[PDB]
Structure 1
């Protein structure tokens, strides 16, 4: 026996059933270019995650509203959606979970929030800043564009202390240019 054999792992996306549907290809490319995604895989995993959330809500809604499992897990699901900024305190019902869309999840990405908070010039500029270790969520540097920000953490997005844009020393391009200028 190897202990490592007991480590779990799973899949995070499914490919479309119809690969060459022109309507779908048009809608997906619009979301990919709007949010600066790397490929269709990034959009497919968000759809995969959304399907899981909606499926959980549908099962709960099919039970009696007095069912203890309906009450307990329903509150947990609503609490989870509120903590990430998907739902509002005025939408505290499982029926509002079924009304969520892919755009709601893509708007909570770190890449989207870095752009819509003014830190970046374009959605594609935010992508490079995140992966280049210029952003931090609170005290922690985050270099994953797919990081899903929480409502309690959205106000702490700032430049990293080690970045040239956050108080750190200038990068190696300016430093070399300064060195060359000094040599003159």
Structure 2
């Protein structure tokens, strides 16, 4: 027996059933370009997560209103959606979960947030800044654009303290140019 064998893993996306739907392709390209995604796999992963959440909500809504399982899991799901900013306090019913779109999840990406608060001139600039270790959520440097920012952590986004845009120690290019200009 190899103990590593007991670790489990799972897939995070599925390929489209019909590869060459023109309307689907146009919509997907529009979303990818708007949010600066690297490929269709990221969009399909977000769609997979949204489908899972919507299926859970739909399953719960089938149960009786007084069912303890429905109460427990619905509260858990609503709290989860509220923590990540998907739903507003007024949106306090499982029904509003079914009205969630891929755009709602995409708007919670660290890349989209970094672009929106004004730390980047463009969504692609936000991507390159994040992957280059210039952004931190709290006191932790984050380099994953897919990072889903919670409501509480949204206001803590700032430049990394060890980066040129957040502290001192300019980049290697600037240091090299300064050294060259010293002569």
When the two structures are superposed, what TM-score results if normalisation uses the length of structure 1?
Answer: 0.99
The alignment partner of 1:141 has SS state of coil
For residues 168 and 16 of structure 2, the distance between their equivalents in structure 1, rounded to whole angstroms, comes to: 45
**Aligned residue in 1 for 2:90:** 90
- Residue 20 of structure 1 deviates from its aligned partner by 0.5
- Residue 154 of structure 1 deviates from its aligned partner by 0.1
The Cα offsets for residues 63-86 of structure 1, whole Å up to 9 and x where unpaired, read as 000000000110000000000000
Instruction: Identify unmatched segments of 5+ residues in structure 1.
Output: none
For residues 58 and 145 of structure 2, the distance between their equivalents in structure 1, rounded to whole angstroms, comes to: 30
- Residue 118 of structure 1 deviates from its aligned partner by 0.3
- Residue 168 of structure 1 deviates from its aligned partner by 2.7
Instruction: Identify unmatched segments of 5+ residues in structure 2.
Output: none
- Residue 131 of structure 1 deviates from its aligned partner by 0.2
The Cα offsets for residues 14-40 of structure 1, whole Å up to 9 and x where unpaired, read as 000000000000000000000000000
The alignment partner of 2:50 has SS state of helix
**Aligned residue in 1 for 2:103:** 103
How many residues were matched structurally?
183
**Aligned residue in 2 for 1:66:** 66
The alignment partner of 2:33 has SS state of helix
For residues 130 and 48 of structure 1, the distance between their equivalents in structure 2, rounded to whole angstroms, comes to: 24
For residues 168 and 99 of structure 2, the distance between their equivalents in structure 1, rounded to whole angstroms, comes to: 44
**Runs ≥4 in structure 1, deviation > 3 angstroms?**
none
The Cα RMSD (Å) is: 0.4
- Residue 136 of structure 1 deviates from its aligned partner by 0.1
The alignment partner of 1:140 has SS state of coil
**Aligned residue in 1 for 2:125:** 125
- Residue 160 of structure 1 deviates from its aligned partner by 0.4
For residues 36 and 80 of structure 2, the distance between their equivalents in structure 1, rounded to whole angstroms, comes to: 26
